[PDB]
């Protein structure tokens, strides 16, 4: 439980995190379906309890860069990823900052508002400075 | 002139509570972008003339040859579903622009 | 003024957790990037608007 896994349940092959649901299914049901008609929960066939299925956490990787005509130093955004999941992969950290946009790595958070330069999103921007 | 102004702004508040159609342009934009993502997700359930929509139903019972025939319909259909969504979203982006 | 920015893993949408579907998708080459460049082009503009 609470781990990303390749599951199979009575022949329902798939991949994701498994979790203990609060959803009650009536006795004849075995899969849970979301509005999209996509699967979102399953019953355990041995200890008849309902389990939520959630995606293994994933996102775009964006590299924030000054010009190569300026530097080799770069920062990386893992979009909509919670910082606690990037240690799995720069996972040394030393400079890590978590935002509404995801986890930003290799950039120094500074309280001073400057004018926007490279747009990160969710009110955040980045730039190259002393 | 001020009392008319003050009364008129009161009527804006009262009106915006009252009418559901007021913000209709904005809601119709949300509804279209949402409808297109739910449409794009529901296309994953389509068979495209394959024996199943579920990728491992095809792989688990077949060899490299018969799987390539079957999976290549799903790749065709799903790529055609993205090229559809992105065409709609590009066209819809020009309306928003 | 704007709409929701949307970005898609063309590989995860077509082929989620299958190397086989990935290798068959390579037969079509750059189309997944062409789509992602377009959705990025939309998404960037939403800030501009």
């Amino acid at each position: 439980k609470n781990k990303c896994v390749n599951f199979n349940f009575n022949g329902l092959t798939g991949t994701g995190v498994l979790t203990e649901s609060n959803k009650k299914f009536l006795p004849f049901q075995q899969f849970g379906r979301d509005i999209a008609d996509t699967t979102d929960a399953v019953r355990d066939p041995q200890t008849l309890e309902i389990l939520d299925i959630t995606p293994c956490s994933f996102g775009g990787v964006s590299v924030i860069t000054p010009g190569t005509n300026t530097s080799n130093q770069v920062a990386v955004l893992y979009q909509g990823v919670n910082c606690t999941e990037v240690p799995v992969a720069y996972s040394t950290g030393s400079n890590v900052f978590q935002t509404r946009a995801g986890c930003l790595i290799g950039a120094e958070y500074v309280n001073n508002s400057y004018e926007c330069d490279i747009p990160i999103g969710a009110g955040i921007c980045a730039s190259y400075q002393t | 002139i001020a009392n008319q102004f003050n009364s008129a702004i009161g009527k804006i508040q009262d009106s915006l509570s009252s009418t559901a159609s007021a913000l209709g342009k904005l809601q119709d934009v949300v509804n279209q972008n949402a409808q297109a993502l739910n449409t794009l997700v529901k296309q994953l359930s389509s068979n495209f003339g394959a024996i199943s929509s579920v990728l491992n139903d095809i792989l688990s019972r077949l060899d490299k040859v018969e799987a390539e025939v079957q999976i290549d319909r799903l790749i065709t259909g799903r790529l055609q579903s993205l090229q559809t969504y992105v065409t709609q979203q590009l066209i819809r982006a020009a309306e928003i622009r | 003024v704007s709409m929701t920015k949307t970005s898609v893993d063309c590989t995860m949408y077509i082929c989620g957790d299958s190397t086989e579907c990935s290798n068959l998708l390579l037969q079509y080459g750059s189309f997944c990037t062409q789509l992602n460049r377009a959705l990025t082009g939309i998404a960037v503009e939403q800030d501009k608007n």
Partner: peptide
């Protein structure tokens, strides 16, 4: 106004937060 993850579809945040838009307004 009254307002997918596991299929690779992701909703990116706007650059201006609804606070920054309240500021410019």
């Amino acid at each position: 106004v009254t307002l997918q993850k596991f299929n690779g579809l992701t909703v990116l945040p706007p650059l201006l937060t609804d606070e920054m838009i309240a500021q410019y307004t």
